Amino acid sequence: RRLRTVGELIQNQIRVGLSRMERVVRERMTTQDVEAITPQTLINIRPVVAAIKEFFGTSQLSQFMDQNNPLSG
Amino acid sequence: VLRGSRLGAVSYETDRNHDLAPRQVARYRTDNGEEFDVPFADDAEIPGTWLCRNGLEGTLIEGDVPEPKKVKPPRTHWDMLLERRSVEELEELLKERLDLIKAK
Amino acid sequence: DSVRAYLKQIGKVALLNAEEEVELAKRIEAGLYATQKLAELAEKGEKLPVQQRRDMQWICRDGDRAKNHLLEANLRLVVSLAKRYTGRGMAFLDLIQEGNLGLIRAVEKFDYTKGYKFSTYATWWIRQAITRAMADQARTIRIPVHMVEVINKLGRIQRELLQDLGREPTPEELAKEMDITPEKVLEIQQYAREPISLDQTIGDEGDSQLGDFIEDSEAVVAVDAVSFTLLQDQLQSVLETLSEREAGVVRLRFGLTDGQPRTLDEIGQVYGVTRERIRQIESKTMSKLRHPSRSQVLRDYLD
DNA sequence: GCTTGACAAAAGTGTTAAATTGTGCTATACT
Numbered sequence: 001r002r003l004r005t006v007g008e009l010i011q012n013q014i015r016v017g018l019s020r021m022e023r024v025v026r027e028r029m030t031t032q033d034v035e036a037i038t039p040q041t042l043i044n045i046r047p048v049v050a051a052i053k054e055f056f057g058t059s060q061l062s063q064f065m066d067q068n069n070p071l072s073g
Numbered sequence: 074v075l076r077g078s079r080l081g082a083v084s085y086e087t088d089r090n091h092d093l094a095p096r097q098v099a100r101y102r103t104d105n106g107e108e109f110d111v112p113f114a115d116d117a118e119i120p121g122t123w124l125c126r127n128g129l130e131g132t133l134i135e136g137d138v139p140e141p142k143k144v145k146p147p148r149t150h151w152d153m154l155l156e157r158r159s160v161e162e163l164e165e166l167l168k169e170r171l172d173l174i175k176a177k
Numbered sequence: 178d179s180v181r182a183y184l185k186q187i188g189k190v191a192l193l194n195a196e197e198e199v200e201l202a203k204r205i206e207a208g209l210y211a212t213q214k215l216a217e218l219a220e221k222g223e224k225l226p227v228q229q230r231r232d233m234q235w236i237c238r239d240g241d242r243a244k245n246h247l248l249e250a251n252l253r254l255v256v257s258l259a260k261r262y263t264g265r266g267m268a269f270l271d272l273i274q275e276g277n278l279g280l281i282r283a284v285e286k287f288d289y290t291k292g293y294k295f296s297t298y299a300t301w302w303i304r305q306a307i308t309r310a311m312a313d314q315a316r317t318i319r320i321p322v323h324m325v326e327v328i329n330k331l332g333r334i335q336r337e338l339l340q341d342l343g344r345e346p347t348p349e350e351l352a353k354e355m356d357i358t359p360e361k362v363l364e365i366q367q368y369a370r371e372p373i374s375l376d377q378t379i380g381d382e383g384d385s386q387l388g389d390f391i392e393d394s395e396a397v398v399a400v401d402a403v404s405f406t407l408l409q410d411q412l413q414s415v416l417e418t419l420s421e422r423e424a425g426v427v428r429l430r431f432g433l434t435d436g437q438p439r440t441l442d443e444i445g446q447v448y449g450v451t452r453e454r455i456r457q458i459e460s461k462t463m464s465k466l467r468h469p470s471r472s473q474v475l476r477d478y479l480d
Numbered sequence: 481g482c483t484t485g486a487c488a489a490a491a492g493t494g495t496t497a498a499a500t501t502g503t504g505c506t507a508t509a510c511t
Contacts, residue, residue, distance in 0.1 A: 044340070076392040083395055085405045092435060150285055151213050154206065157288055163210040167236075170207040174232055192511060254511040282504095291507055298507050305505075321501055454482055 013055040017048030103129035180270050187252045199289040201247040208240010247284055247295075254296060255280050258303050266315035272307055279306025317372055328369050331355065331362060408478045415471055423462045430459055 024044050032042065056062050066072045095115035101123045102108045109125040121139035125131045132139050158166075193201070211233045218225070225233070259272040283299035291298075312325045320328070334354050338346050348359035355362055375388040416424045416433075426448070432438040441452040441459075448455065466472070 045343075046339075074390060076394050078394040081395070083397055085402055086436075087406060087409070088436070151209055153285060154209055158206065163206070166203065166207050167210050167214070170204070170236060171232065174235065251511070257511055286505085287507085293507050294509065296510055300510065301506055309503090322503090323501075450481090451483060453484085457482085 009059075009061060010052075010055065013051045013059075014048065017051030020047035020051070021045070099123075100134045101125055101131035102134060103127060103131035105129060107131075180273075183270070183273070184256070187249075187256075190246075190249045190252075192253070193247075193250045193295070195294065198247070198295045201243045202287060202289050202295075204243035205240050205247065205284075208237050208243065211236040211240065244284065248281065251280060251284070251295060251299060252277065254299060255303055258300065259307060262307055262311060265311055267311050271314075272310065275310040276303045276307045279303045282306070320368065324368065328365060331365055331369075404478075408475065411475050411478070415466065415474055418471070419462065419465070423458070423465070426455060426458050427462055427466075 096112050098110050098112045099119045121133050122130050255276040259276050263269040279302040283302035287298050312322045348363045351362045352359040376386050379387045428434045429439050429444045441455045444455045
């Protein structure tokens with residue numbers, strides 16, 4: 001049994017968001033002018049930001065800080 | 074935690090049958106033969122046709138003929154064909170098709 | 178999914194060649210003309226010979242069968258279009274079925290003299306039928322077609338502007354492109370919002386659903402319900418403290434006796450005095466009641 | 481204690497200008 005730390009938990013959602021971004025980019029690169037396209041004009045960052053927002057907001061692991069006292073936190 | 078309401082509001086008034094609104098009942102009959110009653114106020118102006126429980130627009134029994142309620146006729150497949158083919162062309166079409174079945 | 182039965186059943190009829198479509202359409206037209214001839218000629222007698230009668234009835238049946246066959250062979254077209262619009266809110270198979278109803282209209286209007294394929298014309302009718310179907314039936318709270326179109330236009334513009342700016346635009350930014358006021362687009366956005374499901378679970382577990390904890394604003398508050406009645410008694414006791422001569426005017430003026438307020442003139446229908454005198458009597462009674470000797474009895478019921 | 485003359489504010493009555501809603505049709509070819 002291993003331990004997913006915070007870093008790996010965030011990395012998984014980053015990977016999911018970038019996978020959605022990859023699907024969008026590979027779909028849309030077939031339908032744009034060739035040799036005149038620019039990387040900044042087809043890289044869509046919305047899905048990764050949405051995944052990051054969802055993780056910190058709704059994920060069961062991202063819990064409210066327990067500030068009852070220093071030991072609790 | 075969160076609140077809402079129905080599409081209406083409540084009224085606290087109390088009175089009961091001691092106030093009577095003068096009303097009379099009209100009688101209607103539908104296509105399938107079922108009959109129904111509808112209480113209306115004495116202001117009347119009762120309509121000649123009424124949508125009853127069963128869903129058939131029944132007619133009143135008192136009058137011999139109700140309000141005509143005439144409506145425009147429907148538009149059908151021939152009537153729209155006639156907007157693109159002349160009767161002279163349809164005659165030739167009929168002649169042409171009769172030629173083949175007559176061949177046997 | 179169980180739409181496979183429809184796909185199989187429509188798969189037993191082969192596609193038409195370019196020359197069969199004209200034949201089928203011409204047969205349909207000829208059969209329609211034959212049916213209309215048999216219908217019309219009956220209005221004045223004009224018996225036709227038995228052989229011609231049978232041949233014309235055969236023409237009618239052949240036209241009907243050709244129309245049916247033309248629909249059958251082209252049912253396969255509708256699914257290829259319906260698969261494009263699936264997932265927007267209405268069921269895939271419903272999309273197919275109601276696009277078929279545009280397909281019958283396309284067959285009704287299609288003609289060969291234009292020298293064009295059946296698909297070229299039928300595609301437009303199928304597409305508009307599917308569009309109208311989705312517009313009418315895609316939402317629990319119905320939105321008229323023009324409103325749906327303006328909502329779609331707003332969504333289209335907002336998507337591009339968000340892709341450009343990188344964030345959700347302020348209403349005025351969308352207004353600058355819609356040529357309408359920012360509050361107008363803000364209202365359209367409110368019209369666009371879908372209702373949520375009242376049966377959705379709440380509490381991160383299957384303990385209860387959202388509906389179980391909605392507090393009703395228009396509830397029957399007990400303390401008010403009784404309180405009103407007390408007033409309806411207390412007020413009466415004050416009105417009963419007057420002479421019936423004075424009490425009747427107020428009871429009729431505000432409709433206490435029967436719930437319908439009465440104008441100054443109508444109170445004279447039983448009292449006989451003129452409307453101005455009824456106003457003077459009302460003023461006298463109204464000043465007598467507001468005097469502290471009777472106000473304190475029921476003042477604090479207003480809240 | 482009450483009628484009458486006379487007046488203005490409020491509200492019905494109808495027209496119609498504007499806003500909203502429903503409906504048929506778009507013909508390269510596409511199954």
